[PDB]
Amino acid sequence: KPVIKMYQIGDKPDNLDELLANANKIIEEKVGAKLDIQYLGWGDYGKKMSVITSSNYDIAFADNYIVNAQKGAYADLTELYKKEGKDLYKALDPAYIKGNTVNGKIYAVPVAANVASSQNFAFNGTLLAKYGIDISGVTSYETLEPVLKQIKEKAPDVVPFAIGKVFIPSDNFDYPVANGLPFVIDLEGDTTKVVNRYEVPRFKEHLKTLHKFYEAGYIPKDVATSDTSFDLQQDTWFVREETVGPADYGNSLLSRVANKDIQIKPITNFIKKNQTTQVANFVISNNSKNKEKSMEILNLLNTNPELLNGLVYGPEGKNWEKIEGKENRVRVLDGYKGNTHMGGWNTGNNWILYINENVTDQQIENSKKELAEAKESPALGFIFNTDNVKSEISAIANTMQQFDTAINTGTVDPDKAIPELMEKLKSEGAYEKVLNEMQKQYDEFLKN
Ligand SMILES: CC(=O)N[C@@H]1[C@@H](O)[C@H](O[C@@H]2O[C@H](CO)[C@@H](O)[C@H](O)[C@@H]2O)[C@@H](CO)O[C@H]1O
Ligand SMILES: [Br-]
């Protein structure tokens, strides 16, 4: 009975022992293995894993998937999916296959959740109710400014907009590769061309908007170095940006974890793309000596309702109880409020998850409506080939790192800093080389 070492992003729940104890009860019974989760934290998960990958594990939360897949850091899963992961493979929307297949080979166990999703303003309804601030005209950042002014007056001690050092203005863009290049596909523009986000006149606008937010104090002054969370349960923040999807049932899940009414406002379109498919992938180590077992566990994580909810909702009777009368329905208790559970988006199949009392019958109907009506990005399945430009990438992803954080967070004036970035980029030659190559492959992708 071997021990399976799984690396996970984020902070560990306080009841982790209890969480694995009841989990292993089922896992051992059906697999004969013992899962061990080591959380690695948030802020520097990218670097902390890079050490492990460079320097032995079994399962891991995938950091920069597409890149580390072409290098051979991830084990092949095509044959495992034909046996130990046959069940979970059947429950997967084909778009997950489109997005996580590199060189006719898949290395990921994508968590079946929001395969399509939009970026949203999540509002604190406790602060919305108390001051009656009108969020009816908010369709962008530009329209979010007036609403930030009000909360700054009525509640000076609350952070209006709560963002961090990872913040980039969200738009209707498509990243064939990022991290960490400024190359997008403008889904509101020429869908055939690959462009620079800083040359898109409306994204430059978001930057102006966010610099005004900085100057006005709607944004934490130390935002360029701030990597801190704002627990949704706490009224430290007024509004934040979130990825919201069908497996969340609108603001049902948001209002649940926050233990208060959370209102949401779309700022991007609802679409199926690589980014949405690769948002939460699980991989198995190249050097993993329990590969066949690792898939047998990622299977149980995505196919067993009891096992999954025992981690996502937490212990039964403490954090939740079942609703007698209606099947597949539960209600969270007092035990749920706090670090006593995991997140569903990065643990397993969001569909075998029980549904909480606060989800309306219209919220389930809308999760069926959004699902079926979900449109696909023309670049979905477009995995960029880096064989020719592996080092021309790191030249650009270096010039960016020297400037992008201060810019994307609005700390500096885009009118002065954006030309600095461009000139240093265009002076190189790796810019035009990767730009052309990217356009060249994308042409062949739409040519077919
Ligand atoms: C509230 C909740 O559980 N929401 C999840 C989203 O977080 C998730 O989006 C991701 O969120 C993480 C951390 O905030 C971030 O690192 C990712 O870039 C991504 O934005 C979403 C994914 O479909 O699923 C929701 O349920
Ligand atoms: Br534009």
Author numbering: 40 to 94, 97 to 489
Copy the relevant paper text:
The genome of S. pneumoniae contains genes that encode a suite of proteins that are biochemically capable of performing the various concerted steps needed to completely depolymerize and transport all classes of N-glycans found on host glycoconjugates. Here we characterize SpGH92 (TIGR4 locus tag SP_2145) as an α-mannosidase that trims the terminal α-(1,2)-linked mannose residues on high-mannose glycans to generate a substrate for EndoD. We also identify a solute binding protein (SBP; NgtS) from an ABC transporter (ABCNG) that binds soluble N-glycans and, through X-ray crystallography, reveal the molecular basis of its interaction with these branched glycans. The identification of an ABC transporter that possesses an SBP, NgtS, that is specific to the recognition of N-glycan fragments suggests that this is likely the convergence point of the complex and high mannose N-glycan processing sides of the N-glycan degradation pathway, with this transporter functioning to import soluble N-glycan fragments into the bacterium.
NgtS also bound to Man1GlcNAc; however, the low affinity and limited quantities of the sugar precluded binding analysis by ITC. Instead, we employed a UV difference binding analysis by taking advantage of a perturbation in the UV absorbance of the protein upon sugar binding. Used in a quantitative fashion we obtained an affinity constant of 1.2 (± 0.1) ×104 M−1 for Man1GlcNAc, and thus approximately two orders of magnitude lower than what was obtained for Man5GlcNAc. Despite these two complexes being obtained with different ligands and in different spacegroups, the overall conformations of NgtS were very similar (rmsd of 1.0 Å over 427 matched Cα positions); both complexes were in a “closed” conformation relative to the “open” conformation obtained in the absence of ligand. An overlay of the structures in complex with the two ligands showed that, within positional error of the structures, the location of Man1GlcNAc is the same as the corresponding Man1GlcNAc portion of Man5GlcNAc. The reducing end of the carbohydrate is oriented into the base of the protein binding cleft and fully sequestered from bulk solvent with no room for additional residues present at the reducing end, consistent with our proposal that NgtS specifically binds the products of EndoD hydrolysis (i.e. having only the single non-reducing GlcNAc residue). Only four direct hydrogen bonds are made between these two monosaccharide residues, though a notably extensive network of water-mediated hydrogen bonds is present. The recognition of this disaccharide motif is completed by the indole ring Trp386, which sits over the glycosidic bond and oriented parallel to the co-planar arrangement of the Man and GlcNAc pyranose rings such that the aromatic ring of Trp386 packs against the α-face of GlcNAc and the β-face of Man.
